[PDB]
Design an enzyme around this catalytic site. Structure first.
Site, mmCIF file in Angstrom:
data_model
loop_
_atom_site.group_PDB
_atom_site.id
_atom_site.type_symbol
_atom_site.label_atom_id
_atom_site.label_comp_id
_atom_site.label_asym_id
_atom_site.label_seq_id
_atom_site.Cartn_x
_atom_site.Cartn_y
_atom_site.Cartn_z
ATOM 1 N N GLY A 126 45.385 47.496 36.309
ATOM 2 C CA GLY A 126 46.611 48.116 36.781
ATOM 3 C C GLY A 126 47.553 47.123 37.441
ATOM 4 O O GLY A 126 48.775 47.197 37.292
ATOM 5 N N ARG A 174 33.769 42.396 39.127
ATOM 6 C CA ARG A 174 34.640 42.388 40.305
ATOM 7 C C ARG A 174 33.951 41.869 41.568
ATOM 8 O O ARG A 174 34.598 41.268 42.432
ATOM 9 C CB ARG A 174 35.247 43.766 40.547
ATOM 10 C CG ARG A 174 36.479 43.999 39.709
ATOM 11 C CD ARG A 174 36.971 45.410 39.805
ATOM 12 N NE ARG A 174 38.336 45.520 39.301
ATOM 13 C CZ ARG A 174 39.048 46.640 39.291
ATOM 14 N NH1 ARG A 174 38.527 47.761 39.756
ATOM 15 N NH2 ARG A 174 40.285 46.631 38.819
#
Ligand SMILES: COc1cc2nc(N3CCN(C(=O)[C@H]4CCCO4)CC3)nc(N)c2cc1OC
Length: 417
Positions: free
Chosen positions: A397, A39
């Site tokens: 998500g 990330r």
């Protein structure tokens, strides 16, 4: 669904400007060190572009974990990310022990040209999510004036705002939707991710195959339902498969994961698949285990033999991998969300590993392969396939919200073109 209608970083004039940028630096940690920096790297292109185009500063903000609006510097500090980021940037990163207040604002007011600054976890403040828990464990709602003040302070930290936090784009949190600056731009990771999913969902190369696995199925209903209107083929593997198998084949599944509520809609799902011309691939054989342990005693089962009572299916078998392979081979585009077995244990990782092999080979002959975030992306890290598929999403998500046909608050709050 792409950022076509929205202001993007590449069109943003940042020369001599302070850029406050929301990133998703919520990386997995163990013992105060990062175990996956994916990330962080993913945000480097936006950061580097800003520095390269004469930005005065880049002030980075993110959350880490779920401290629920209480300061937890010894559990959820972003300090380690500061260090890793400096390594990736080949450049100093200044870590600030807060993300608002007078002192933070003074450090960001007029930094030396080229300054990279990373703020402390946004979620140490209840105003970020707008709710949380107090020191005592009572749930609390943030107050409106304090929320606005929190947002006003974040806004002061830059002259222009970039959101590169795809992984958090489904959260309507203050740093994501509440920054008030004239230009609010999507970063390069936001654009990239949105462009991959937008094509997959609106204009995929076909046949379009969805690989849906992972554990539970109830949380996957609207997902399957929605994808059935998009794909030409769907693999249903991992934990979810047993609910289907039982309803459709009267399979004895032992103590395998089973979702009673989901059982009720399986036939309706299959009717929808059939009506739309979607070929569903379910597993046909399994690696079994006498208990949920990395070391359990193992065995084999097929749909016809059933899984012995007391035993559970923790991975699909060789014949299943074969059918999975056949669907992959037909695919021209693939979105894969959910491993097809308990990958983190050697005895139950063959199926997911085998599927990963096929997906890489598929990529090598031109198939567009999108790996959702979560466990699937972890698998890419695990087996070193991050650069062997088309796209490894940073948002599990968030990607799931998109696959379900939902909107992303972080995207809509960007400036319109
Ligand atoms: C075949 O694919 C999967 C099967 C999975 N099964 C499980 N469980 C988790 C917990 N289970 C049990 O503890 C057994 C034994 C006691 C209750 O039933 C049932 C099996 N968990 C998971 N997390 C599973 C994940 C899988 O793929 C990702």
């Amino acid at each position: 669904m792409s950022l076509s209608n929205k202001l993007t970083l590449d069109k943003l004039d940042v020369k001599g400007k302070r850029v406050v940028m929301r990133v998703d630096f919520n990386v997995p940690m163990k013992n105060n060190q990062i175990t996956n920096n994916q990330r962080i790297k993913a945000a480097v292109p936006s950061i580097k572009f800003c520095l390269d185009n004469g930005a005065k500063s880049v002030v980075l903000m993110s959350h880490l974990g779920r401290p629920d609006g209480v300061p937890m510097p010894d559990k959820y500090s972003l300090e380690p990310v500061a260090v890793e980021l400096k390594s990736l940037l080949g450049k100093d990163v200044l870590f600030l022990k807060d993300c608002v207040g007078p002192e933070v604002e003074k450090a960001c007011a007029n930094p030396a040209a080229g300054s990279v600054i990373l703020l402390e976890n946004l979620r140490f403040h209840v105003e970020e999510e707008g709710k949380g828990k107090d020191a005592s464990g009572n749930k609390v709602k943030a107050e409106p004036a304090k929320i606005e003040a929190f947002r006003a302070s974040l806004s002061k930290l830059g002259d222009v705002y970039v959101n590169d936090a795809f992984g958090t784009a489904h959260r309507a949190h203050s740093s994501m939707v509440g920054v008030n600056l004239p230009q609010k731009a999507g970063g390069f990771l936001m654009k990239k991710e949105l462009n991959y999913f937008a094509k997959a969902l609106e204009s995929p190369e076909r046949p379009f195959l969805a690989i849906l696995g992972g554990a539970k199925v109830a949380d996957k209903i609207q997902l399957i339902n929605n994808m059935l209107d998009k794909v030409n083929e769907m693999i249903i593997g991992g934990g979810m498969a047993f609910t289907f198998l039982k309803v459709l084949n009267n399979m004895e599944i032992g103590t395998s994961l089973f979702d009673e509520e989901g059982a009720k809609i399986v036939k309706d799902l299959m009717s929808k698949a059939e009506k739309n011309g979607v070929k569903i691939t379910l597993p046909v054989d399994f690696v079994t285990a006498d208990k949920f342990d990395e070391n359990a005693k193992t065995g084999q089962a097929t749909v016809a033999s059933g899984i012995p009572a007391g035993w559970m299916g923790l991975d699909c078998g060789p014949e299943s991998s074969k059918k999975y392979a056949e669907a992959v081979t037909r695919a021209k585009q693939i979105v894969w969300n959910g491993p097809v077995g308990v990958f983190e244990w050697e005895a139950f990782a063959r199926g997911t590993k085998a599927l990963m092999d096929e997906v890489v080979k598929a990529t090598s002959r031109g198939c567009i392969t999108t790996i959702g975030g979560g466990d699937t992306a972890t698998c890419c890290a695990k087996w070193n396939t991050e650069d062997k598929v088309s796209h490894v999403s940073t948002g599990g998500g968030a990607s799931l919200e998109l696959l379900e046909g939902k909107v992303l608050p972080g995207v809509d709050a960007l400036s319109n073109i």
